[PDB]
């Protein structure tokens, strides 16, 4: 009921890194404090590392196990965007803002970081556990994918959106907004594929899959809180970032056809600013 519509929306959102000139960001970058520059670098590396997993494994593995030519085509298109567009875009932002040696060090740090690794490996673990012709294992991986696309990225997206909403780092913020817009539709689409599997299950199996999804969400959420404090306490933003994580967790659940887990909260306004005909045959006029 939905693949051709998503095909259309995906291909009409096509874009390339070269379209946004990045050099003018140096005019606001130079005015940020060390903690702001440090947080931005770390967040950016976090997003880059997670998105690479999605391009190399997440999207291609789902495309491999999903049946249907049209679904495979949409999934291929999404994998292409991860590897050919998003990955180049993140690299471009980095090369503009930091010298080569600084980029290498930030990636070394974020690669060793406990909270980034915990979530990256949890997601990758579920992708590696998919078994041929087993729709339960596929569903679990789709849940992981939706959580990455619609939830885990957002502790990171917060900061570029925060600057973007203030008039700072506008070129890279525009790029991030385009990336985020792609991840949103990726999350919705994979969510619909997961609901299709979920709806084929018994009531007991459904309850079991719901418990899986909520348990996974809880593990990721508790690690996100730690990840958030680790990055954002030094710039005083953690309270507001936490509200943004919960709001996006609720969107991820709704993508999977589940009820929201967290109470509704308002979001930081700066980040918000960043964001059957049958013809009448006669004899029907007579009764």
């Amino acid at each position: 009921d939905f693949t051709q519509m998503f095909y259309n929306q995906n291909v009409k959102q096509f874009w390339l890194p070269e379209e946004i000139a990045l050099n003018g960001d140096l005019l606001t970058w130079k005015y940020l404090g060390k903690n702001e520059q440090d947080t931005y670098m770390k967040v950016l590396a976090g997003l880059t590392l997670l998105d690479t997993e999605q391009g190399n494994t997440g999207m291609p593995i789902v495309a491999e196990h999903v049946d249907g030519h049209q679904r495979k085509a949409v999934l291929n298109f999404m994998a292409m965007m991860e590897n050919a567009v998003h990955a180049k875009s993140y690299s471009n932002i980095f090369m503009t803002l930091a010298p080569t040696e600084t980029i290498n060090e930030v990636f070394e740090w974020v690669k060793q970081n406990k909270y980034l690794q915990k979530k990256a490996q949890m997601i990758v673990g579920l992708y590696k556990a998919i078994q041929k012709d087993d729709e339960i294992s596929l569903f679990k991986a789709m849940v992981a994918s939706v959580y990455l696309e619609s939830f885990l990225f957002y502790s990171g997206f917060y900061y570029p959106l925060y600057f973007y909403g203030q008039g700072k780092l506008m070129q890279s913020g525009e790029i991030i907004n385009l990336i985020l817009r792609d991840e949103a539709i990726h999350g919705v689409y994979v969510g619909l594929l997961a609901q299709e599997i979920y709806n084929k299950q018994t009531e007991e199996k459904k309850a079991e899959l719901r418990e899986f999804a909520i348990d996974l969400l809880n593990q990721l959420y508790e690690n996100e809180l730690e990840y958030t404090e680790d990055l954002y306490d030094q710039v005083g933003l953690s309270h507001d970032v936490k509200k943004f994580i919960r709001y996006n967790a609720n969107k991820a659940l709704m993508n999977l056809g589940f009820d929201p887990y967290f109470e509704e909260e308002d979001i930081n306004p700066i980040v918000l600013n960043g964001l059957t005909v049958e013809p009448l045959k006669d004899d029907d006029f007579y009764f």
Binding site: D259, P260, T276, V277, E278, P279, L280, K281, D282, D284, F285, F287
Partner: protein
């Protein structure tokens, strides 16, 4: 999860294969004990409560001043003498969430049900203690339910108006269009729904003072009114709901209908404007005979004849328009247009189908004006005159714009008390008081028509609930017999009370002498046909009640001829979808949509079983979607013959049925005398 919601959640937890309907009483008891009593602020005496509410701008001090404090105290005591207990959790929840007075921080409950009822009764009586106690007994017995604006805002200071709906006639000028937008925003600020007649607006591509093909048609006015209602949306408490009505012979009818298409672009699509289509019998005749029809340009007709297109008789003037070279028109296929209407109702529920000749064939005030359009709920069918708003510093020719003061009879409670006459008369008095105390300074035509016409709306509800709780199927002929008898008695007593009010006040509504009430044409079918029940089972329901016979109707006709009628219009059946929960009644005379409604308020689902639903009457509460729509049309036409205004007739359709089935139901409704069709709900 709250305890009351969890107990209400136990309804669908079936034990022994049966629903736990007894858990709803437990749910309401838990709701009260754990939330309502705890969150209700209590005063040492009624004097302290009234003083606190008057001083804190909660109550008007004017309406409470006509009674001595002992009178108000005794009114409250006789309100609590009933010891009213809500029968379902949803009733109490809806009342204390939508109508009960709360503090400025919306944290504590200031009004009980018996306090809202007492305040509304004191407002209705206007200085009469005995009448106030009569109103208290009427409402605490839940025999009569004042409309949501009236029940919610009677006696309150932070109030809008007590009128539930307004109908505006828009003339064909920029001054009139701008004033219509202004009045729509003013009345939406007051909280009432606004319906506008766009049939007088000249078509798209017409001439503006020798400048040809300059008009945007009625669709530009729809965009203006849509943004006006969005702007004046009662600050977000409830989105501003407006209605636009257009004759099916208007040239813009296809553009008018295309506003509700999903594929329509945002530059032509309206979102807060409900659309209604007025279908004269001529259109049905043309569609039946498959002849190619013509929609006309209203301004050409105005220039040629001096009267607006909707002001003339379509059945008589159609051939003259078609044979007139000076009347511009475009050829349409009436059957294709009917199919487009059916598909639009299937896909969106719009437009509101109004059969103009079905309204005007039994319309008592055709001398004042024909009924050219209905309200937002397609049940207020009254004569209206367009207002010619002139330039600034130029006196405007103020016409009549319909203001409808609504009130609902609970058929179950009225019949169980054997009090049709007293309930109808007290409700008529209360609606007369609401009409009198209502003034609207920013709508000259609404105010003028309220003062002159004095039209009220006395609806009814819990028809299906009463029938199912009495073992009567809504589609059965016994149900139609009961509706015929009950609504004949309701009409009899409404007319009697109107004539008594006209006698007591010495005044009738404006232009009463030209109405069928004065000439006696209204009572012809009542002095000729006996409407007593034909089934002994139905006749046993009216035991202990005097059913008006032919002789009684002759006496009432003579009484009306001698003394007149105070109200131009008295009966109109509104959907009453919100106050139905509080009264534990089915919405309107419509059949129930669901046996157990599933509602989500927050993060918890709240099931509402139908009023009186149980195991013994499970199949009598047949869902409206499973019912034959022809039988529902028969029921509504049986009711409609005793209602001078319209009935909010909603069509409940299944997904299996096509657009031809919808057209067949529409044409059967037109043939059976149905005046208006509200919605096409698909399951």
């Amino acid at each position: 999860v709250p305890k009351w919601i969890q107990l209400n959640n136990e309804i669908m937890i079936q034990k022994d294969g049966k629903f736990q309907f007894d858990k709803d009483k437990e749910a309401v008891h838990s709701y009260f004990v754990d939330y309502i009593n705890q969150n209700t602020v209590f005063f040492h005496n009624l004097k302290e409560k009234l003083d606190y509410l008057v001083e804190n701008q909660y109550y008007e001090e004017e309406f409470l001043s006509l009674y001595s404090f002992e009178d108000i105290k005794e009114v409250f005591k006789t309100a609590y003498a009933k010891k009213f207990r809500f029968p379902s959790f949803m009733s109490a929840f809806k009342f204390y969430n939508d109508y009960a007075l709360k503090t400025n921080d919306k944290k504590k409950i200031l009004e009980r049900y018996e306090d809202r009822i007492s305040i509304v009764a004191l407002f209705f009586a206007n200085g009469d203690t005995e009448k106030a106690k009569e109103y208290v007994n009427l409402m605490i017995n839940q025999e009569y339910q004042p409309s949501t604006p009236t029940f919610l805002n009677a006696g309150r200071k932070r109030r809008g108006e007590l009128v539930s709906c307004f109908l505006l006639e828009v003339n064909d000028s920029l001054n009139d269009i701008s004033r219509a937008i202004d009045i729509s925003m003013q009345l939406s600020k007051l909280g009432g729904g606004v319906s506008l007649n766009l049939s007088k607006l000249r078509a798209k591509g017409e001439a503006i003072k020798d400048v040809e093909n300059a008009t945007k048609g009625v669709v530009g006015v729809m965009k203006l009114l849509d943004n006006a209602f969005r702007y004046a949306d009662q600050m977000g408490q409830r989105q501003g709901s407006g209605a636009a009505y257009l004759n099916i012979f208007h040239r813009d009818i296809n553009d008018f209908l295309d506003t509700k298409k999903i594929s329509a672009d945002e530059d032509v699509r309206v979102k807060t404007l409900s659309i209604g289509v007025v279908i004269p019998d001529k259109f049905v005749e043309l569609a039946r005979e498959d002849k190619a029809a013509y929609v006309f340009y209203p301004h050409t007709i105005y220039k040629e004849y001096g009267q607006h297109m909707d002001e003339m008789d379509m059945n008589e003037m159609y051939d003259k328009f078609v044979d007139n070279p000076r009347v511009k028109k475009e050829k349409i296929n009436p059957r294709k247009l009917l199919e487009k209407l059916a598909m639009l109702r299937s896909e969106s529920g719009y437009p509101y189908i109004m059969f103009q000749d079905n309204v005007n064939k039994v319309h008592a005030n055709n001398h004042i004006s024909k009924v050219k359009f209905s309200n937002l709920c397609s049940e207020v069918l009254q004569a209206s005159q367009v207002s010619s708003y002139t330039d600034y510093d130029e006196e405007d020719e103020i016409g009549l714009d319909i203001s409808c003061n609504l009130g609902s009879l609970n058929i179950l409670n009225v019949m169980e008390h054997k009090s049709i006459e007293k309930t109808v008369k007290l409700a008529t008095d209360s609606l007369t008081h609401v009409s009198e105390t209502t003034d609207i300074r920013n709508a000259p035509a609404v105010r003028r028509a309220n003062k002159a016409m004095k039209s009220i709306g006395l609806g009814a509800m819990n028809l299906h609930g009463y029938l199912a709780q009495n073992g009567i199927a809504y589609e059965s002929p016994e149900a139609r017999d009961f509706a015929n008898t009950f609504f004949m008695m309701v009409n009899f007593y409404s007319i009697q009370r109107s004539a008594e009010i006209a006698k007591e006040k010495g005044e009738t509504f404006d232009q009463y002498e030209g109405s069928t009430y004065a000439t006696g044409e209204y009572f012809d079918k009542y002095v000729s046909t006996d409407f007593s029940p034909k089934y002994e089972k139905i006749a046993n329901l009216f035991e202990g009640m005097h059913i008006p016979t032919t002789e009684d109707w002759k006496k009432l006709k003579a009484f009306v001829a001698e003394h007149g009628m105070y109200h131009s219009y008295r009966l109109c059946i509104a959907p009453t979808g919100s106050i139905s929960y509080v009264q534990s009644s089915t919405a309107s005379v419509m059949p129930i949509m669901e046996r157990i409604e599933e509602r989500t308020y927050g993060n918890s689902k709240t099931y509402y079983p139908m009023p009186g639903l149980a195991s013994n009457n499970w199949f009598f509460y047949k869902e409206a979607y499973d019912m034959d729509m022809f039988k529902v049309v028969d029921m509504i036409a049986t009711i409609q013959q005793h209602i001078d205004q319209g009935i909010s007739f909603t069509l409940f359709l299944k997904d299996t049925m096509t657009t031809r089935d919808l057209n067949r139901i529409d044409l059967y409704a037109h043939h059976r005398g149905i005046k208006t069709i509200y919605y096409a709900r698909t399951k």
